[PDB]
From a paper:
We describe the development of a biologic that takes advantage of the proximity of the N-terminus of bound ACE2 to the three-fold symmetry axis of the spike protein to create an ultrapotent, trivalent ACE2 entry antagonist. Therefore, we sought trimeric scaffolds to fuse three ACE2 moieties and leverage the inherent symmetry of the spike trimer to maximize avidity. Thus, we determined a trimeric antagonist fused to the N-terminus of ACE2 would require a short peptide linker and would be less likely to form inter-spike interactions. The collagen VIII trimerization domain is significantly larger than the collagen XVIII domain (44.7 kDa and 19.3 kDa, respectively), but more importantly, previous studies reported that collagen VIII melts at ~45 °C66, whereas the collagen XVIII domain melts at ~85 °C (vide infra). Given these observations, the smaller, more thermally stable collagen XVIII trimerization domain was advanced to develop the trimeric antagonist.
To simplify the nomenclature, we refer to these constructs as TXA, where ‘T’ indicates the collagen XVIII trimerization domain, ‘X’ refers to the number of residues in the linker, and ‘A’ refers to ACE2. Next, we turned to cryo-EM single-particle analysis with trimeric antagonists bound to SARS-CoV-2 spike trimer to validate the design. Starting with the 3-amino acid linker construct (T3A), we observed electron density for the spike protein, each of the three ACE2 moieties, and collagen XVIII trimerization domain of the T3A. The electron density between the trimerization domain and ACE2 moieties was discontinuous, reflective of the flexibility of the 3-amino acid linker. Moreover, modeling of the trimerization domain presents the “axis” as slightly ‘tilted’ (nonparallel) with respect to the C3 symmetry axis of the spike protein. We then attempted to evaluate the ‘symmetry of interaction’ between our ACE2 constructs with spike protein (T0A-S, T3A-S, T5A-S, and T18A-S; where S is the SARS-CoV-2 spike HexaPro protein) by likening the C3 symmetry to an equilateral triangle with all sides being equal length and a corresponding standard deviation between these lengths of zero (s.d. = 0). Thus, we calculated lengths (distances) and corresponding standard deviations between the Cα atoms of equivalent residues in the RBDs of the spike protein (residue D428; as determined by Fan et al.) and in each of the ACE2 domains (residue N137; arbitrarily determined residue on ACE2) (red and black dashed lines, respectively). The calculated mean distances and s.d. between spike RBD were: 41 ± 3.6 Å for T0A-S; 40 ± 1.0 Å for T3A-S; 40 ± 1.0 Å for T5A-S; and 42 ± 3.2 Å for T18A-S. Equating lower s.d. values to symmetry, we determine T3A and T5A to have higher symmetry than T0A or T18A.
Numbering used by the authors:
A (entry chain E), B (entry chain A), C (entry chain C): 1 to 51, 1019 to 1614
The structure:
């Protein structure tokens, strides 16, 4: 013993001096002060002034790769932005060529990185970067298995994107999922029209995708075994996995544990929320919604019941008190996309974050990019590299565009935060961190205190409890509404990749937890021909939906840390972090690392805990929970799986 | 590789450097010097210039307690001292009121100290001080149990004090134990007179204290059992218990066997001593002590048979030969108690111990201040605190009081010696150290060498073996004689606390142990109605009687070590530590430590033996041991338990 | 937090410097230097000039021994040198008298060493010294057992030296082993005379040697068993044993494994070598040796078959191609013995090794000093100690003596290299390391480039490939041919010491391995009455013979390492080390270690491998192996044990 016992600050040393054993060096990492642990305290130690292995070759190989990678990635990034801004055939070709150049280049380095054995490589950053490169992808399988898996992904993504259903009343009248079916599942309130749209989408897509999905899963599973995973779920569980880090290693199975462990705390709030929606639905559809039965899968505000936000019309806590809107004030104050972005930039400056790049304005587009060029209006950030930061969207004078602008800007702030890190580390620690950071900025941007501070919300405006309940429930519909849907679906892919559910029970098991975990009942029964669990975008397009679940746990914890940092006074849903420079600095310390460090370390450095939890959400919706329990003390609370609209 | 080991002191590492492997850095916590262990020596590495937790709160909690504890204890000691030296109603009020507030102060800080656990404390001193504070004692039980236990002790204290037995000849003529009954069996040699007083007290006290003793023992055990002890004997055995110290841990059960083992090897010396007393008692009581039977209880020169000092008149080795006493020379030089205490002060400066403050002398009652105010003449020490010291003794100009002055001042020097220790640690290592220090110096003072040096004894005094045996036997009767009685009484009390001796067999086993361990048999058959063991002041008032046996073992070890350090030659009873400055410095090494260190470490450093032993006892009385065998060859050696004066 | 990392040796530091993080202070005990670790390298920190127990007693006792031992050994060496240079009765006594006094000094020092145990020494060098002196060896037995070993050892030595066999035709014509019997089997090619010489020697001398060798074997086993060995074979294996060194321990049992493992790898080379010699023996003895059976024992060029170079007259690959001979140039250039050593001195200077000092020329004779005083013409290297190194040889103007002087020069330079060690540690690592140094110097002196550089080889000479084959086969007969003989003899001597085979099969086992391991069958069967295993000098003189097998393994490894530094291109046997200073410095570092450091580390330092390996042996004779396989593909390869000339 009597070795190196080093920590960050002297305050840690004062609290841990009794912990440090006799003879152990007390080195303060931040203060660069060295002390020796002696009898009842520490003594000052004299310090002087600050001054071919394969691992050395790997460092040369890795850095050399970066310079090539930076250039080629920029070409692919630019080709994408040009194609995204203007969808033309020429824009496609360069995107293909740059992507083909980029993809081919990466595998050569991937194979070359695999030539380096990581066991003899001890640098934490270097070893992580190499394995981040040594990943061979689908090439770990055979080419034909890679060919099948990729082509199916091309087809499955195409089928979901091109999934179009036709009503039996008119064969020629066919409506896509968007905007045809989704508007019907959200805006239309007809029992049959929503039932048909829900049924037809899962019929013409699920039946076609089910054979493709069956082969897709095993292809994804066998590569996971080829990549040393129990299933492709564990392959996606390796994304949050932390290995080799003392005090921060995160096992893949722990991801399943934490998601289920945190989900059980959401059930009581959700159950009363589920009962209240059932209580409100039975006020609108008493026949279609039983007081004890589950909520029909076609009356949930969207195709799959993913979000209950569109049910706010039928489940409004207080019709006389609408949600706080300052979009008209923006119209009154003549605010527009550049103004909103400038206000967002000012808000980011308000929390101490640096002002965003001016080159963004020259390069990125905010409003609708006309019609000659073809572009997507969805909020999309663009960290093209080499200091090139952009956001591609059509921003109008609306809160949603205002909030998503904050959501997208936070990504860019995160993008430049880890831009100092190498290209391999130039990304978020996990898939949900950047999105979670984007959300909390929008949430703070949506705070009425911020709106009142900036003048969007008038000073004489009052935030009554009914409005807060209206706000919280709308938050619950958006956030807590999708949590059970996210929890089961990701867990569904977990067991499907693990093969727990046999082919002849994928649909039956889906409806088993639909009515039980989520309390959602299919209006008409579906069999294994249907592939409704894969009918969503992420499952069809092979995206781990856990990102939404993880970020929601992260964002509330981060916001809770923000509220603690900003010293919020009031309801947690009213927590505004405006004019809180220190919180941005603390957030910057997390964001500056990006993915250079384990996400558990970053999570603890912000919220104080190395594990995600839903404790802020319970605090966030605590007044709402009491109101929901008060509203549900009369109506039945829970859900009966046996009941169904078809029986 | 290599390791670094730190030393508190440079000299400890210098003597522990050869076994250190080469390459280990040599660092000392005091000199802060850098050395590297190299081949056959060490190279001095050049060094540059010098550049919450419960335990820290625990350290601060103790220090604040020490300030108020030192103040209130000083007032309590002062108030009690006034009552002793001046026995008046108001002085009694001061002694009671100050003690009550001190008692109230002790429990309040003890309760507050309970919120400072001992396990997380790294400092043994900090943990030990709180452990003394956190000792709930009788309060671990319910409040009624403590009150009734004190009620028994109050009744035990009053009854023992007021125990008066009336002579059958005159019912009005009644005598208390002190000084009436004690003088009967110490001065009067009439067997019947001693027998009546011995039986009357044990009958009167026994019939009223036996039922109280049964309950008092149970109450003492129950709190000990709740205080994690097997019995109240183990509760008292925790005084010598050592825990948490490497190389010096002492267990409570180790105390039992050490006292037993030490006494067993004393028996061959004691059996000859018992035989000679038995042989000499026949010369005065031919029909009352058998040549093989055990000694009569009241024929031992004292009340309980504890001290055989008065038997020296009847069992003198050579009555014609004089005894070591310069009491006449004390008054031939026109001295007094003040000069006697001055000689006691001269004794400490002769052995090298520093002189004490004059404040002690001006506050100490060395002689009774007349008769208008009553001064308690019971020898005691007063470590009042804040450097205040007093001696409660009506010392006169006599050799007997000359040793008493040395004995009491020995406690005072010891009490001030560990003043550097905290108030909780301002005490002796155990209950047999301060008495040991004062006894050995008095014995050294009583030697002819000390008396001749200061002119108390003429140099023409004949230091022949005739006076050597007479002095040894008188010391043996006082010191060696009380060891068998002290050992059994604590052993008997231990089994009563442990419940081993049946309640209907306490009296028989007490005398059976007296018959066997001590070779002393009661003159009248006492049943369990009697409470002869509790007739002692210590047993009734709940005083651990093992302190005297340990003190006797410690003092001889202390004395022999001083004589060995002073290069004493010849019989050990003539050893004088006067004019030996090294002996006091050697003695003072433990005296400053006090009770912070284990007593085993204290005993080993002073003497050389970690545990107790009887080797100094054999060295002190070796001429007597051979002399006893010469006188005891004509009579039985040992004792016979069956014989009794009543049968 | 960097801290300090310490290495005892540079090799440990360099081998571990890669894993040292930047900024770590690095200290090397051997170099007494400070280093600061940086990226992909280390930076040295400059320094100024260097600044009771049994361990202390042992160092003093050993240090005083070395100086005294050097003198007495030098006196014994001085007298022995005079005895060998001058064969006179006076010189015989001086060698014995100085030797006896020196031997008595070792015995006295050994007695004083036995009280200094090795385990209590914290200095590795000090512990090793007493180990080599505390070895009682033959003295662990009784005086009579030691006495009876000495007489038989000399008796079997004298009988071997005075092996007298007389021709049956002429009783008075008796030829001794040297030069009579040896020349018969070396120069004379008559099968019958060699058959008689081999048979008569092993018959008359074998009968006399057998009781002496068997008794000597048992006694050598008895002492070794009492010396903590399984047998006397293990006693000799203890010289090569290394224990207690991390990464360098060598066990005695592994020596048996390594010898057997290496010999199996040499079998493919030897089977073709045996086949070709068998093919060539048929060209001269078609009626005695078959193409399938083994070889006659006397048809190996010697009675024991140790040296097969005498067969080169009948087994030459090409009788017309000249070998590497420069004796003509030596005579033409008027060279003598002094020029040979001077040319050896020039070669050693060119390679960087130090030149021979003044004491060599002034004290060491180089030619036989006429008939006035007889000089032992056997070439011996005389390390008399205390700066006295001498070479004894009857060197003539010949190429053979030119190599032999280099052989003695290698030993002399080997001896002086480890002079920095104490006298006890001033010895070779084992019994095969030192002999390897001499042979390679002769091999280096035999290289064509060295002769050409010094003018011995005419530059106009053409080095044909066939000449290389003849050179390699001639070298193979001397060295590669002797490997099977050394393996079986040591394996047989392992059995006789360990007693794995009863005495009635010792000779049967000796020829069994001759038929199988060596592929050589005795022309006349021999029973246990003979002592053919002891017919060699070392077996008949209590000398291990495995030292030469280790010598062969070490010398080629040494030869490979020297060419590795020289970076020679082409055949290994054509490599030269002239004008290669870096090779000599590394070689001298190998020679300066002596026995103070493990030979496994020394073998690692020179080459890189800590275990035995036969790659240099195959590399040196790589053209020879292909030539033998090409020539022996038309003939039977291997041997048949059953076949015999007498059967």
């Amino acid at each position: 013993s009597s070795g190196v016992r080093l920590w960050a600050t002297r305050q840690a040393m004062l609290g841990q001096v009794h912990e440090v054993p006799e003879g152990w060096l007390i080195f303060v990492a931040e203060q660069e002060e060295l002390y020796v642990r002696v009898q009842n305290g520490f003594r000052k130690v004299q310090l002087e002034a600050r001054t071919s292995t394969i691992e050395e070759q790997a460092k040369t190989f890795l850095d050399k790769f970066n310079h090539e990678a930076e250039d080629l990635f920029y070409q692919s990034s630019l080709a994408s932005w040009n194609y995204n801004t203007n969808i033309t055939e020429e824009n496609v070709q360069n995107m293909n060529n740059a992507g083909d150049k980029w993809s081919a280049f990466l595998k050569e380095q991937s194979t070359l990185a695999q030539m380096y054995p990581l066991q003899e490589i001890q640098n934490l950053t270097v070893k992580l970067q190499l394995q981040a490169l040594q990943q061979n992808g689908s090439s770990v399988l055979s080419e034909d298995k890679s060919k099948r898996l990729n082509t199916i992904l091309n087809t499955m993504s195409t089928i979901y994107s091109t999934g179009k259903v036709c009503n039996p009343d008119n064969p020629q009248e066919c409506l896509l999922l968007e905007p045809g079916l989704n508007e019907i599942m959200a805006n239309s309130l007809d029992y049959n029209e929503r039932l048909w749209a829900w049924e037809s989408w899962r019929s013409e897509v699920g039946k076609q995708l089910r054979p493709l999905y069956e082969e897709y899963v095993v292809l994804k599973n066998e590569m996971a075994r080829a990549n040393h995973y129990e299933d492709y779920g564990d392959y996606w569980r390796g994304d949050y996995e932390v290995n080799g880090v003392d005090g921060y290693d995160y096992s893949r199975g722990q991801l399943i544990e934490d998601v289920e462990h945190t989900f059980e705390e959401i059930k009581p709030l959700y159950e009363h929320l589920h009962a209240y929606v059932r209580a409100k639905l039975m006020n609108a559809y008493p026949s279609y919604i039983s007081p004890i039965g589950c909520l029909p899968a076609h009356l949930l505000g969207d195709m799959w019941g993913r979000f209950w936000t569109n049910l706010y019309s039928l489940t409004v806590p207080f019709g006389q008190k609408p949600n706080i809107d300052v979009t008209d004030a923006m119209v009154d104050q003549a605010w527009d996309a550049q103004r909103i972005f400038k206000e967002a930039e000012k808000f980011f400056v308000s929390v101490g974050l640096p002002n965003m790049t001016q080159g963004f304005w020259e390069n990125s587009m905010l409003t609708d990019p006309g019609n000659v060029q073809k572009a997507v209006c969805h909020p999309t950030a663009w960290d093209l590299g080499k200091g090139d930061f952009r956001i591609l969207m059509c921003t109008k004078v609306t809160m949603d565009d205002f909030l998503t602008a904050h959501h997208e800007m936070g990504h860019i702030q995160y993008d430049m935060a880890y831009a100092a890190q190498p290209f391999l580390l130039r990304n978020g620690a996990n898939e949900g961190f950047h999105e979670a950071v984007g959300e909390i900025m929008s949430l703070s941007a949506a705070t009425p205190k911020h709106l009142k501070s900036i003048g969007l919300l008038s000073p004489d405006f009052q935030e009554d409890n009914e409005t807060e309940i209206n706000f919280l429930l709308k938050q619950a519909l958006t956030i807590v509404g999708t949590l059970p849907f996210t929890y089961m679906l990701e867990k569904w892919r977990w067991m499907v990749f693990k093969g727990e559910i046999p082919k002849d029970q994928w649909m039956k098991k889906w409806w088993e937890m639909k009515r039980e975990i989520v309390g959602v009942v299919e209006p008409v029964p579906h069999d294994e021909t249907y592939c409704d669990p894969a009918s969503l975008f992420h499952v069809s397009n092979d995206y781990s939906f856990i990102r939404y679940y993880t970020r929601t746990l992260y964002q509330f914890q981060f916001q809770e840390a923000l509220c603690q940092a900003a010293k919020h006074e009031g309801p947690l849903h009213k927590c505004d972090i405006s004019n809180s420079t220190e919180a941005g600095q603390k957030l910057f310390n997390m964001l500056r690392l990006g993915k250079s460090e384990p996400w558990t370390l970053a999570l603890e450095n912000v919220v104080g805990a190395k594990n995600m939890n839903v404790r802020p959400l319970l605090n966030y919706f605590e007044p709402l929970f009491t109101w929901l329990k008060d509203q549900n003390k009369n109506s039945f609370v829970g859900w009966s799986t046996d009941w169904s609209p078809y029986a």
